A paper describes a structure:
The replication of positive-strand RNA viruses relies on virally encoded RNA-dependent RNA polymerases (RdRPs) that are capable of rapid and processive synthesis of the 7–14 kilobase viral genomes. To examine this in further detail and to validate the polymerase–RNA interactions seen in the initial poliovirus EC structures, we here present nine new coxsackievirus, rhinovirus, and poliovirus elongation complex structures at resolutions ranging from 2.1 to 2.9 Å. All of the complexes show the open conformation for the active site wherein the β-strands of motifs A and C are not hydrogen bonded together to fully form the RMM-fold that is commonly utilized by polymerase active sites.
Last, we further extended the length of the RNA duplex to 30 base pairs with a longer (GA)3 locking sequence in the r5 RNA and were able to obtain a third structure of the PV polymerase EC at 2.9 Å resolution (PV_r5). In contrast, the PV_r5 structure shows significant rotations of one EC relative to the other and repacking of the RNA-RNA junction as the crystal lattice is reshaped to accommodate the longer upstream duplex regions. 2Fo–Fc maps contoured at 2.0 σ are shown for the PV_r5 structures where addition of 2′-dCTP results in one incorporation and translocation event while CTP addition results in two cycles of incorporation and translocation. Despite this common lattice organization, the different dumbbell pairs and their RNA-RNA junctions displayed a multitude of geometries in the different crystal forms; for example, the junctions in the PV EC structures range from near perfect coaxial stacking to highly disordered structures that could not be fully modeled into the electron density maps. A comparison of all the RNA-RNA junctions, shown in Figure 3, reveals geometries ranging from fairly straight and essentially canonical coaxial stacking (PV_r3, CV_r2) to slightly offset helical ends (PV_r1) to highly distorted geometries with frayed ends (PV_r5+2).
Author numbering: 1 to 462
Write the structure that this text describes.
Amino acid sequence: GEIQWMRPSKEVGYPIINAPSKTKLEPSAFHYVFEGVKEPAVLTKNDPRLKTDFEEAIFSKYVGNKITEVDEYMKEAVDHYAGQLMSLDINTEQMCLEDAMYGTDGLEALDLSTSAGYPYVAMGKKKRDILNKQTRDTKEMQKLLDTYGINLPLVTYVKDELRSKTKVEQGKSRLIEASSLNDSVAMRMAFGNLYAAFHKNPGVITGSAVGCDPDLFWSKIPVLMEEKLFAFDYTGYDASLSPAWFEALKMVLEKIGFGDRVDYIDYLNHSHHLYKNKTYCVKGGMPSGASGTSIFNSMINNLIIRTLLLKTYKGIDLDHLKMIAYGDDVIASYPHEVDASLLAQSGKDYGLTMTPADKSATFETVTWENVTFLKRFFRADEKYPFLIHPVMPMKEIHESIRWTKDPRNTQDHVRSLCLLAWHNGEEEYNKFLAKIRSVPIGRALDLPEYSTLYRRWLDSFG
RNA sequence: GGGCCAGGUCUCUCUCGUCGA
RNA sequence: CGACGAGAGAGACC
């Protein structure tokens, strides 16, 4: 991905966007009870914790493109992957407008608590003003399609989130591209039946995790995996993706029957952006919050691993590759050990910057003891070894609890962390309930015991 | 609430129900 | 006990 040009949105006639200036995150009643080192991400240039120039930093993720042409490995990569997907018999029909707005089986209705994007943002208009779940009226939206059409600009916002010290100082905040209400709808009409099929079939056919519930699914994953595992992290995955990869994705969509819509993918590759007082074009790089970003990032992720294995390990039977991706995250198996250090080198020639898994120092062998997925570990239950605990380390749970976006919700917030935390096992869990209760607000909460959660978990296989 | 923020998945909580044994 | 509808509110993850 590469910024093609930038300039004052007034030079062009685009309005300014009101970006918020201060975080919703504040220290919580538990801020001093636990240990943490994360703070709210930098949101603006004036932020005193900056150790460099903000806009320089936030936009630095676009490293540039590596390749414009789809290689022969990619082409095969495509063929194989499209092959898998064909086995799902995926409905290729356009989705009806009423469903793309208000939802249907396998696809959730649009969120009316979020923005409608450009141009509606600027008129001060809102999603609730065009959609009505009660009537499920489509007539008004249709006119807005007729009016403003599609391929509208993405409105770019800073992600408001807990981030590590250096990343705070270094100003490396994450970005969010706000899809036009018009484009989400066109996308859903074009690909809704695609999205729903993925939502319905998380696993090793789709190669996607979207739609899994880690509490139940963790126990199914080892069963689907081949004998040996490999894995790695990506650097700035989204903003590295070279336009070649989009062309590959388009090929997959033709090959599985979505040939006419492969144009929509073009708007994701060559996008135009509003950001406060500025405006810019980007070539390459998946836009953070466009319709289908989870699905397409996973699909391209499926093509990358197939490609890299080919231009590295000749005579690899991609039929015995078993992977699951959530966007850039991935867990992958094969019958013989494979060398992430080796695939990492290949990746370089594709604009992909691939580091060792679990932020490790040097490349290492992945086992069921040290593999992570969606930030969880795998630990077999001590009494039912075919049941696998998704294990969120306490460390990340400690970080979360030390802040809040509204103390009014302190009970829900903490209750929700227990559901993650108890998989560390009774000892650490009761020590966690102890620390919560070591302050008065702690003791005002209704919290569940290990015995209760362990019971409910065991019962959900049933 | 603190001063106008995307696309999603899963989970939990409150209120109202449809079909269902 | 079993899907799912809407109205809310939140948490984690990508």
